[PDB]
Ligand binder design. Structure first.
Ligand SMILES: CC(=O)N[C@H]1[C@H]([C@H](O)[C@H](O)CO)O[C@@](OC[C@H]2O[C@@H](O)[C@H](O)[C@@H](O)[C@H]2O)(C(=O)O)C[C@@H]1O
Ligand code: SIA
Lengths: 486, 486, 486
């Protein structure tokens, strides 16, 4: 009777702590390495495609952004790195990032007219500019209304809206900053004009800040936009003696989470995924991927490693810690192919290989739970990785980068070793299953047979195909074949 | 002589990497799961109970916050999620969070009169409002002084204080923003009024920003409060031609650490703990708890897991890697109950179970250090977990959340596996202690006895209760009982 | 034949999760602890040497920072803790820390006369102060002009530079806050001065913020500085009806990456490191360290642990899990000193110890990869650890601290255990290599010899120095010496 272990036509390599590229009977890849290649829906809900527009361009209504389709509900937003179509009329947007973050995800998001354009009878509401040229005549942000002096009188401008819409509302307004004192008068008549907005929480009065600036889109003026959320049943009151760029529309909101803005140059083509990547979608179950850090969804703890393969089987020797495998049992049996560990008897009747399915199961059973624990215990939530920072937020942006890298180095190390260890342990586990079988036999037979020391036992008597089957059976009978020596 | 291992009436389960809910002789819970249920002192030092007041309401002296007891020294602050009693007169508070954070912990904190109310002889110092109604007449923040024009003259208001108090001082001031031009004149006479504060480090001049706003507490006006720390021996100079809401009191400070603000709806009832939780106090020593993230004190690395139990004993088989346990030694001995591993002899004199205390000690010794290392090596400092962010600090707040979650996923995984591994290792350790004893015997006896293969040895001679005791004794005598074939 | 193991008069005590102190043969170090004391260079480049000058003292031209060596490159920047000479003339610097981080690494840095001082014809260009005394006449930051009135007039000041340098150019202007209205008319002859700076991306007005404040350097006034970065073929623009402090010089700035600022009081010493410290230059390849947390560059991780003793050789007790070492083979052989494991034969010819180099190699081979994996798999990038936060950025600064500590506790724990485990495993590995050799022999000899049970075998026949050599040879011959029983 001979003790030995499965061998086979496997070429797969695992790494251990003591040795690299070790060939094993069977392994398992826990690192997803491949992506869809296309941008797709995230839980059925599509993203908001902005093409070459920017969030500011979109919400203000830059005439170049007219051609947009806005599903009242989106899961993520796709914005180019540097959109062409932003503020067509030059200027700035206040707390822009905080707004970008706020409108990460919506459910839903619907535009409503709050201060109808033609209700400004005491003022001119037609001013446009080359900056926002259409076909190509002076035009302006579709959602905003440029109040100018009527004839030669800019009366107190007054507007107000009560949020009876049922959901919080995003409202944006502007303040124009002209090139010189005369442009100021030419447009709004009186200097020392002001724009004053007011809600239960907001209080702000703006005076036009004038300065000689270069030409951006042939404009020296500047429009400084600001925004607020109008709480439900709250009212917002505008009042201006000139220089205000009032809104015509408000935006009904309705959050329920916190997604993110994906920066890509692509264009969704309708697929799916619990996880989307700036490079393509991921379809997987493995505790790790290495595609891209800035994922959006429920994602396999992105690690910085080229591969992660767990040893499940034993070292594959052709022909350890416990001596059996690639040890005193010099080699493996290509012949045995119904299990990992087994016997091979030379009887009165041929034979013959037979795997000990019982101990091969306890191994397949265990090694399975090892693979699963390594996976199933990984924690996974919904998260958007990439955020936005202004040019004067370098430190904050860096703090955030160092934080991401920090967790990247940790999850990499951790995973990279959990593979090394655990392979060194999976292997020595098999080696211990074999040398454990070599003893389940030796300790049944005892002196009824001689121990060849190559894994084989030579019987000091006769063993029919019913005695052999009894040793594997786990039930021998030493108190019988005992009297039967030499 | 028979080799075997302890078994007993244990029902406790541990998990390993290869198998779940494995029954073991003895385990150990490292995860604290239960809390005090009440809010208590933290190192003897009590918190600051705010009830339904807010930090702004408290420090400004909202008349509704009059009924407060302020132990000059606190360890943490208890603030409702949304206090009723904040700024009774509507408005805003600048850098409010940065102030909340600053006054996390004090040692001590004492109020001093810095600009006595009645020293404003050239101005009216009695203006109140329905917003801050008392009994219920127009009133105002107890700690602030509302300067209004006297008769019909608002002379230059001038006040100043030199910090001779010995410790840094928190000082708050306001600027009122009226509804219209006339309210402005009605109150402070001259328009274009200003408020200018000055120290060695502070420099600020404010002009009232006016706008038509809705009514909050029946008020259209707004008071915008700001604050500074007055360094020791430095002086602060107020100067106003109207609109100023000067302080009457300053606040002596004195930090020495950085605690936090606990957001609860409870009310301390005098107990203790090195660790308090929004849900109750924790009394423990275990490396982990799962009660609540936002703890205050020195806290067991809060993990997101339902249980963490370490295997200390061996697999409990009634009636492995090394073959002994639940292997060739088919089962355990309910009979043996003075150790983990032992013998059982059938002699000329009854018998009888006897644990090998020596090897049972080396096991109890080792397994103890495993449990301790897992615990004692956990790093633990003082930390407050929850901080505050403004409505325009969404990103910052999210960055901070993703950071906490990040470490939560790590400490969870780490602990969750350290249990799996280390149980798979604690068990195979026992199995190796047994099969190691089976050899400490077999290798003494050799051919002087036969090896039954069930764990038992059958003597090829006589072994009195002094020979048996000699095998356990570790000192046999093969060169004696040798003469007696068989 | 005896199959004991190596040893030596060593008192190196390693650590395991079961045993506190474990005197062992060979151990390794992984926690580099030593550094120059030289502030060196990073990848070849020098720091910016600053002296008792602050980064603003410098750029502004505080005339105490003449005594300086400014260099067209830097990998970081050495700055004193509390520099001596910064703003001679008291003030504020807007977005200061957001600028420091910007210029913390550059390539290059060039100052260029951009706005010659004379060509201000209409104004005075020779304002100065004893706030800023040189020898010691009145003076002023030697890069700034305090435009004041000429005659009784302050004509509108207008400055313009269309950046033609080809490099982006950081430009810094300032704004004076006179002690009171009349000093204001004294210096600038008209309140309602405003200072307007505008570019393609920046637009700012600002008005004197006069307050009655204390003296800093006997100075009541304050100067407030604010910067920007004028892009290629853009053009910044000035306009002030008073109060401007203008640049005379911008700076060419070419960046390629991040970096930090090192708060030390030393001097760079011409040399080399790849990872700096406020207390010296680390050079190593180990995965960890514990010099200083505030590192700049490619460094090993910083863990809060005293000693990282690994393990590189069996346990020690000259005269485990596998029974051999400090077990049935009672002790080790001072005598054997050409390997870890070996034989010792008493033959017809003396003898004699001989290490089994083959199995001693597989051990030296493996244990090497364990040490290397533990090291070589540590991830290491370039990083500056310490950043700067304003006094009103307490929360942000704390968020960043808790983040560093967070990763410190993790890398400490992780490393602290990886040592415990892995030592418990290195040791039991040796113990398994021995008891594995004891079987490579026993299983060759079988009954041809008796098994003394102390590690030794006694031959039931004759074994010349060619038979002994054959057992170690791995090739015995049981089918020969079989004839010579008892
Ligand atoms: C110091 C002082 O003047 N206190 C007043 C207060 C303030 O002037 C006002 O709150 C600033 O906005 O006004 C009080 O009455 C406000 C009152 O105004 C009338 O025009 C109107 O009829 C009322 O509906 C109401 O708005 C106040 O209590 O707030 C009086 C208070 O003494
Ligand atoms: C440009 C100018 O007029 N500088 C003068 C300043 C300023 O008037 C004040 O500092 C304004 O705060 O005051 C001095 O006493 C000073 O600095 O020694 C005299 C100096 O010549």
């Amino acid at each position: 009777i001979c003790v030995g272990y499965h061998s086979n036509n496997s070429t797969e390599k695992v790494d251990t702590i003591l040795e690299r590229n070790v060939t094993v009977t069977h392994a398992q890849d826990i690192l997803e390495k491949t992506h869809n290649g296309k941008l797709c829906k995230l839980n059925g809900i599509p993203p908001l495609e902005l093409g070459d527009c920017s969030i500011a361009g979109w919400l203000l209504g830059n005439p170049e952004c007219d051609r947009l389709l806005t599903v009242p509900e989106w899961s993520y937003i796709m914005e180019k790195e540097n959109p062409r179509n932003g503020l067509c009329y030059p200027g700035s947007f206040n707390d822009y990032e905080e707004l970008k973050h706020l409108i990460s995800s919506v459910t839903h998001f619907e535009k409503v007219k709050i201060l109808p354009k033609d209700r400004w009878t005491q003022h001119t509401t037609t001013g446009g500019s080359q900056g926002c040229a259409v076909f190509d005549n002076p035009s302006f942000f579709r959602n905003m209304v440029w109040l100018t002096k009527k004839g030669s009188n800019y009366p107190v401008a007054k507007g107000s809206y009560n949020n009876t819409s049922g959901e919080q509302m995003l409202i944006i307004w502007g303040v124009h900053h002209p090139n010189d004192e005369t442009e100021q008068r030419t447009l709004y008549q009186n200097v020392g004009a002001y724009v004053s907005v007011g809600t239960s929480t907001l209080n702000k009065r703006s005076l036009p800040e004038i300065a000689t600036r270069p030409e951006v889109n042939g404009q020296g003026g500047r429009m400084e936009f600001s925004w607020t959320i109008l709480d439900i049943w709250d009212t917002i009151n505008f009042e201006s003696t000139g220089n205000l760029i009032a809104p015509e529309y408000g935006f009904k909101i309705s959050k329920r989470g916190s997604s993110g803005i994906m920066k890509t140059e692509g264009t969704l083509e309708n697929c799916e995924t619990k996880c989307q990547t700036p490079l393509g979608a991921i379809n997987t179950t493995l505790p790790f991927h290495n595609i891209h850090p800035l994922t959006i969804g429920e994602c396999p703890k992105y690690v910085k490693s080229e591969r992660l393969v767990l040893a499940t089987g034993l070292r594959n020797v052709p022909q350890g810690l416990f001596g059996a495998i690639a040890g005193f049992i010099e080699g493996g049996w290509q012949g045995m192919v119904d299990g990992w560990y087994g016997y091979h008897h030379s009887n009165d009747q041929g034979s013959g290989y037979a795997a000990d399915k019982e101990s091969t199961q306890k191994a397949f059973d265990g090694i399975t739970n090892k693979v699963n624990s390594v996976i199933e215990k990984m924690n996974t939530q919904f998260e958007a990785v990439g955020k936005e920072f202004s040019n004067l937020e370098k430190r904050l942006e860096n703090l955030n980068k160092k934080m991401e890298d920090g967790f990247l180095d940790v999850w990499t190390y951790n995973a990279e070793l959990l593979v090394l260890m655990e392979n060194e342990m999976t292997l020595d586990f098999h080696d211990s299953n074999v040398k454990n079988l070599y003893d389940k036999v030796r300790m049944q037979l005892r002196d009824n047979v001689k121990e060849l020391g190559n894994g084989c036992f030579e019987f000091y008597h006769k063993c029919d195909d019913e005695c052999m089957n009894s040793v594997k059976n786990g039930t021998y009978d030493y108190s019988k074949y005992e009297e039967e020596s030499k």
